[PDB]
From a paper:
The MSP signaling involves four consecutive phosphorylation events at: (i) the kinase domain of the sensory histidine kinase, (ii) the receiver domain of the latter protein, (iii) the histidine-containing phosphotransfer protein, and (iv) the response regulator. The second element in the MSP system, AHP, receives a signal (phosphate) from the receiver (REC) domain of HK and translocates into the nucleus to phosphorylate the REC domain of the RR. ARR1, a type-B ARR, contains the GARP domain for DNA binding, in addition to the canonical receiver domain that mediates AHP1 interaction. To bring new insights at the molecular level, we investigated the structural and biophysical characteristics of the AHP1/ARR1 complex.
The asymmetric unit (ASU) includes two complexes, each consisting of one AHP1 molecule and one ARR1-RG. While the electron density map clearly defines the entire AHP1 proteins, the region spanning 77 residues (from 159 to 235) in ARR1-RG is not visible, indicating the flexibility of the fragment that links the REC domain and the GARP motif. ARR1-RG contains the REC domain (residues 38-158) and the GARP motif (residues 236-296). Notably, the α3 helix is slightly bent compared with that in the published GARP structure of ARR10 (Hosoda et al., 2002). Despite being separated by 77 residues (159-235) in the ARR1 sequence, the REC domain and GARP motif interact with one another through a vast interface of 1044 Å2 [calculated by PDBePISA], as shown in Figure 2B . The Tyr291 residue from the GARP motif reaches deep into a hydrophobic pocket of the REC domain (inset). In other words, because part of the GARP interface that binds DNA is also involved in the GARP-REC interdomain interaction, GARP must be set free for it to bind DNA. AHP1 is composed of six helices with various lengths (from 3 to 10 turns), in which helices α3-α6 form a four-helix bundle. The phosphorylatable His79 (Ruszkowski et al., 2013) in helix α4 is exposed towards the ARR1 recognition site, which is highly conserved among type-B ARRs. In the case of ARR1, it is composed of the catalytic Asp89 at the C-terminus of the β3 strand, the double Asp motif (43-44) in the loop between β1 and α1, Ser116 at the C-terminus of β4, and Lys138 in the loop between β5 and α5. ARR1-RG binds AHP1 with a 1:1 stoichiometry through a relatively small interface of 875 Å2.
Numbering used by the authors:
A (entry chain D): 38 to 158, 236 to 296
B (entry chain C): -2 to 150
Write the structure that this text describes.
Amino acid sequence: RVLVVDDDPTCLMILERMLRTCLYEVTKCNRAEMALSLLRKNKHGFDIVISDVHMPDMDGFKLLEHVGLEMDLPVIMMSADDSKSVVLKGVTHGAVDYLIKPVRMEALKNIWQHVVRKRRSKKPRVVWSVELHQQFVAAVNQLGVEKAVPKKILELMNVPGLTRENVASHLQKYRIYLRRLG
Amino acid sequence: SNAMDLVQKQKSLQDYTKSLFLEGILDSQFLQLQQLQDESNPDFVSQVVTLFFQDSDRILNDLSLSLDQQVVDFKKVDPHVHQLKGSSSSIGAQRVKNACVVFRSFCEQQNVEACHRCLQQVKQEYYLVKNRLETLFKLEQQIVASGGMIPAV
C-alpha cells in the first residue's frame, strides 16, 4: 500500500512499524531515483508515498513534484523541520499533506483519508505542470482557502486552456493540505 | 539463586526506567517506542535503539572530520546535524534533540567556533543517553539471565 522514502534509517524503521500497526503494507526506500524507478514499474500498485524533504540523491521537493504532479499520486511530505516556510513548500511542490518528525501515531491515521479520496476515480491521468500548480496554490491562498471556489480560482489564474473541472478535481485533491495552512 | 533477588531486580529496572523520564533524558516518544513492542515484535525497542546508535556514531565521526577541515563546508556539516535531530527526536533522546537544534542555529550562521562547542555538547548528550539506554537493556538481560521475565503488555 505505502512506499516510504527516507534516508534516516531509524525514522524509517520506526515509521514502517507504525504504518504496519495501522495495517498498511510498507515498502522502504532511501534514494529518490530509486523510489522513482520503483514507482515507474507497471502494476506496482502503491497507494500512497511518504517521502522526506531531505534526500541525498535528489532535491526532495523535486521528488514531490515527480510523484505528486507528473504522476497522479498522493505524496505526503515528511520533515524534521517545523517551519511555516517548509510546510508551504510542500503544497507548492505537489505534496498532498505533511508529517513532522517525530511522526505522531495520530497523524498517521489521518493519511488514510488521502488514499480513499484518491480511489474515487486503467484510465487516463491528468498531469499538472509544476508552475500551473504553483499558480493554483497562488490563487486559492490569495482567495482565502474557505472562499476559493472553482470559478474564481480559474478566474484568477487566467490560464487559456484551463477548465473548471481541472480546478474542481485539483481543489478535491489539495483541499486538506490548503485548509491546514492558516 | 534467590527468588528475592529477582524481585529486587524487577523493582530496580522499574525505578530506573521511571528515572529516565523524570530526569528529562527521555521524552514520551521513547514510551511510544515501547508501545510499538509486543509479543510479535519482542526486540523492537532494542533494535531501533541499536540502529540509532550505529547511524549516530557515524554522524558524529563525520561531523568531527567536517569541522576539522581547514575550510569548513557547511553543505556537508548541516545535513548531518539535521538527520541527528530527527534521529534523536524519533527515539526520544530529548537532550540530544535540543542540542542539535542549537547546533543548527550555528551552521545557519556559519559560526565555526560555536559549532565546535555545539558538537561537544551533542557528543556529551549522546554518550549520556547511550549510557542510559545500554544500562536499561543490560538490566533487562540480567533479569532474564536470572531466569526471570518482564511481563510486557
